[model samples]
Each structure stands twice: as C-alpha cells, then as structure tokens.
Target: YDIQAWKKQCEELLNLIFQCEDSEPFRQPVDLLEYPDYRDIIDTPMDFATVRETLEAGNYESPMELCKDVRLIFSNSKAYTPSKRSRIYSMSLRLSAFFEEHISSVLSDYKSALRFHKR
Candidate 1:
C-alpha cells in the first residue's frame, strides 16, 4: 500500500484505540513529574498523541513501521507495571492483543488486494 492507503488504515485504527475504554492512560505521554522514573526505566517513550503526530506528518514508511509504535505504547505500559494484577498492566495487554489481531485482519485484506491488483 502507498502512503495514503497506509495513512488511512492507521487513522481509523488509531481512532478505535483512542476510543477504547481503558486507553485513557495510554492516550498521552506519561507525566514526567508524576512518574519521574519512567524515563529511567523506558528509554524511548511512545504514546497515542506522538503516534498521531507522526502519522499526520507522513513519517511512517510502512504498516510495520507504524505497528512498532503501537506495540511500544502497550509494551511500555506493561513493562512499567510490575504486577499482572495491576489494571494498567492488564488493560495494556488486552488492548495490545486486540490491536495485533485487528492489524492482522487489515494486513491480510490489504495484501490480497495488492496481489490482485498486480495482475
């Protein structure tokens, strides 16, 4: 898919993620003051807002590239929360699963269409 196609998919996917019930905490960058150690623990921080900005800037070259940031959003959350019992940990895990599943569906369809177009 071209940049336009990839951008559209990402936009819709991001909207769904942002609207997810447990996504509030992951929507914006973690507060440095509140979680002073966040940077120390996670070297590179990623969030919904940063992803949105990057997407809009046409910075993503591939679906997999965009997927990396999305994965990081959840990975960071899960990594920071020490216990599985923590809601933050659980929510990120759940949402991450949902994201990966949905992306697989979209990617297959996108690929099939591209293959068909090649003829």
Candidate 2:
C-alpha cells in the first residue's frame, strides 16, 4: 500500500462523494437563519462543504478524522430530519449509505496502514 499517497486518495474519494446526486442537498451548510434552531438541534453541525474545507485546510490527521466529519454530516441529517416520510431523510440515508460503500473500501484499509505503523 502506498501510504504516502493516502491524502491524494482521500481527496479523490472526497470528490467522488461530493459529486453524488444525492449529495446536492448536503453540500451547503444548514442555513442557521432559515432553520433557527439548527445549532440547538445539531450538536456538531457539519456539511459536505465544511468537510472539504477541513480536508483542504490540512486539519485532518487521519482517515478516521475525515470519516468522522463525513459521518457527522449524515448523523446530523438523521437527527434533524426525523420523519421517515421526509425526502431529505431518505436522501440523507441513501447518500449516507452510498458514501460508506466507497469509504470502507479505502479508509478502512488506511486505518490498517495506521495500525501497522503504530504497532
């Protein structure tokens, strides 16, 4: 495994995740003004654009940090969009599931790489 290429791989995967059609709704931050209680409801507010900024800013030290941020985006979605009948809820669930299908193939392997280095 080319460990040094991980950042590049992560960037590529991040792009793929961003480009998903379902991700369209998730790309922008929740308009605090629009949903006045967004901050109150979502303890750790997150979004796809924020994730990308975090990544580009070199704030993520590990794949899981990146994974954690991405995970939060959906968890917040599910938490805020509670109704099963809501389109955002379904789209969030679908996009949430879709990302893991790709990240698991890549990030999990990177974690193993980390384990190799750590041990």
Candidate 3:
C-alpha cells in the first residue's frame, strides 16, 4: 500500500481505539501523562508532546528512529516471548506508518528545522 494510505489507516485505527474508552490494554486507570512512552502518538496528547520533545532533542533524526529502537528491543531474543513478539511486530508495522507521517508532518510543519528532511 502507498505510504499516505497507510498513514490515514493507522491514524483512523488509533482514533477508533481512543474512542473505545473501555477496552482491555486500554482500559487502564493510570493517566497517559504518567507514561508518555506508552501512548499512541496520534491517539493521546502526551504522546504528541513526547514526540515534539523527541524531535527537538536532536538525539535521533525523527520519530521513525525512535521506533527503530522500539523494534530492536522488542525483537531482542531475551526481550520478548514468542507470543509477545507477534504482537510487537504487528504493532511495529502499524506504527511504521504513523511514524512516517508524523516525521514528515513535523518536518514540513517546521521547514526551517532541517536542511533536508531525509538523510
């Protein structure tokens, strides 16, 4: 599928999930603000805030770089069980689209931030 199509899809998916308001894995009582790293970027305010901080920090090129770290750790032999890996790989595939769109939008939103958006 085209990148734009995937972005639209991922965004729609997380939006739907956010609207659920009572589902497992998402029905937690804790505030997302307390766990910025766990929120879906397009679904919660904290995730968006964390993304901005990540972008401005200059530690990684873009959100996709941060996602690569997630996948690496998730894939590490000792990090995930076979059952968990299946879910993480699936999550990574979905988030890849989200990260792509977020990075592009962030860069274009602030064109002066980078000489070239791509490496």
Candidate 4:
C-alpha cells in the first residue's frame, strides 16, 4: 500500500483513540516530519542506539541482545527466502558477516578464508 493510505488510516485510528475528530489527526504535517527514518545510515546493529534512546529511554545496551538475536535468526531466514526480500531490510542491515562465515565453512578452503570474496 501507499504511504498516504497508511497515513489516512493511522490518522483515523489516532482520532478514534484520542476521541477527537477535529484534532487534526492528519493536519500537522510539519510535526510529523520530526519522526526521522534513521535506518538508512544505520548499517549495523550498533546503529540502533539513537532509536533506543528516543523510544524506550534505553541506553545502547537495551537493544544489544535483541539485535544480536535478530541478526542471527535473520541470516538463517534469508537462505531460503530469496534475494532482495527480507524483513530485516526494512528495519536493519543484512547479517552479512554470517553469510561470509557460512560460505567459508562450506567451501573448506582455509587459503580462500585467508583471502576474501565479494558478494
């Protein structure tokens, strides 16, 4: 669905939740702009620090455990899911290091392991 459709639905839900029809659920466009998508520059799980701070009053450590688990599980999930198709892509970077380890272990090439390969 388009973002506008979600915007309208969320506005309606917000209106109902706040019990205000004219509360301009969709009115304050500028106010909404304050919500930044930090995912783009967040190339690793460590990049979740700012988001943790803003949403959960959490220090960098709160999400450390969760991010580790998500990164590991997501790597396994992607093996059969197909390229350019992953939930992590929407919220975080791919578990690239996991793939490198997996392939190196499979190839059983210690020499190539000393060298490198690109995706």
Candidate 5:
C-alpha cells in the first residue's frame, strides 16, 4: 500500500483508540498519568500525545523512524502483565496486537519503498 494510504489508516486507528471513551483501556485522560508498574510502565498520555505530535511535526525521514516511534509508544514487550487479574489486562493485550499489525505494515511498506528506490 502507498505511504499515504498507510498514514490514513494509521490516523483512523489512532483516532478510534484515542477517542474511545466507553472501553476498558480507553483513551487515558490528559492528566499526566502512568499505568501502574505491575501493569505497564507507560506514560499513557505522553504515548498517545506523541502520535499527533509526530504527525504534525512531519519530521520522519523514513518509515523506519516512524516505526521506531510507534513501537516506543505501544510495544508488547514493554507493557508487562498486571499482577491482579482484570479485563484491563486483556484489553492491553488486544491493543498490543493492534499496534503490532499497524507497525508491521508500516515497516513492510517502508522496505518496499526502499527496494523501489534502489531499482
């Protein structure tokens, strides 16, 4: 898929999650909070905040850079499972998988671009 297409898709996805209000792992409020250490050592607000920030900055030199930043925000390894059992854990896992899908596609498109450029 074209980079523009990927970008559009990503934007749509981010909006869906970020705007989500009635869900377990909904858009974390903007009050500068972090998920409990047992769950995920993540700055929820900062993580999603950077999505629009990066897009607005338009500073990505390559899709690889974008991929790296996205991983920094949402990564399976980074978010640890909370000790206490709750649906939140399940929701977190689902979000991790979602990020994996989008990030993988972004990287694949970047590789394709590089190959075409070299041709």
Candidate 6:
C-alpha cells in the first residue's frame, strides 16, 4: 500500500545482499568485498556480469532463463542448507526473506496500478 515503504525495504534488501549500508551494489567491486560463507546466496558482481553477458549475447530466451542460470551457478558451486544452525546460514535466510518481500511489494504495486487503470 505504501510505495515509499516498499522502496525502502528494497534498498535494505540490496544492502544486506551486498554487505553494504549505503552503497550501490552494482557499482561496487566484488573482489574488494569480503563475503561470508553464505555469499553464494546473494548476487555478486561476477554473477551480475554473467547474467548481463548472456543477455547481451542473445543467448537467453527470456529473463526467466537468466534467472534460472544465476540460480544454477550458485547451486552448482557449493552445498549449504539455510536451515542449518550456523551464523551465515541464518544471515542467508534473512537475506532471502528480505528479497522476497521486496519483490512482492514491487509486484503488488504493478497490480495496483493495473486495477486503477481498469476503472
């Protein structure tokens, strides 16, 4: 309902994923930052680059395919469960929650806009 609140939530979600409080994750260098054990759960610059390159190369049929590739990259890298009682695991869970909330909020706005347009 509150657009600003949703935007703020998205900002915080990005911060958690990038391990930054007040910085742009896409602009920040991936190698300079030190990630925790659960780093694979978030999108690093390398991951971003891979997704971008695939789109630019016209190799991906749709954005959803790129999303799947990103997930696959991380999934194939290591084996870790978020349910594990570990510090990084807990952090990973929180990060995932935040991302989901942010995305849901954004999509809700689009639905709201569509409803308004129909009237």
Q: Give the whole-model CA lDDT for all candidates, comma-separated.
A: 0.82, 0.81, 0.39, 0.32, 0.54, 0.45
- Range of the 10 consecutive residues with the lowest summed lDDT in candidate 4: 23-32
Q: Measured by TM-score, how close is model 2 to the native structure?
A: 0.88
Summarize candidate 5's per-residue lDDT along 1-89 as a digit string, tens digits: 35455565566667776654422343433232353452335543335556656766776556566556556544432354444355655
TM-score, per-candidate, Cα-based: 0.85, 0.88, 0.29, 0.19, 0.59, 0.36
Candidate 3 or 1, higher lDDT: 1
> If both were scored by TM-score, which would come out higher, candidate 2 or candidate 4?
2
Stretches off by above 4 angstroms in model 3 are 1-85, 111-119
- Give the candidates in order of TM-score, highest first: 2, 1, 5, 6, 3, 4
Which tens-of-lDDT digit does each residue in 1-119 have in candidate 2?
A: 54555577778877887788888878989888888988888888888888888888888887778889888988888889858778887888888887788788677678677778777
Return the top candidate by lDDT. Answer: 1
lDDT of 3 by residue, 24-93 (tens): 2222332547545443422222232233344446555443454454334323312322454465445544
Clashing pairs in 6: none
- Find the candidate with the highest TM-score and give its number: 2
- Give the per-residue lDDT digits (tens) of candidate 4, residues 1-119: 12123223322332342343322222222121442443232333222223223224432232223334334433433332335554444222323343334333323443243344331
Per-residue lDDT of 4-108 in model 1, one digit per residue for the tens? 375688789889998898778889999999888998789789998899889889897666777899889888987898797998888888888878887885666
Work out how many backbone clashes candidate 6 has.
0
**What lDDT score goes with residue 47 in model 5?**
52
**Model 1 pairs whose backbones collide:** none
Tens-digit lDDT string for candidate 6 (43-80):
43334445555556667643335446544433423344
For model 4, name the residue pairs that clash.
none
Among all windows of ten consecutive residues in candidate 6, which has the lowest summed lDDT? 20-29
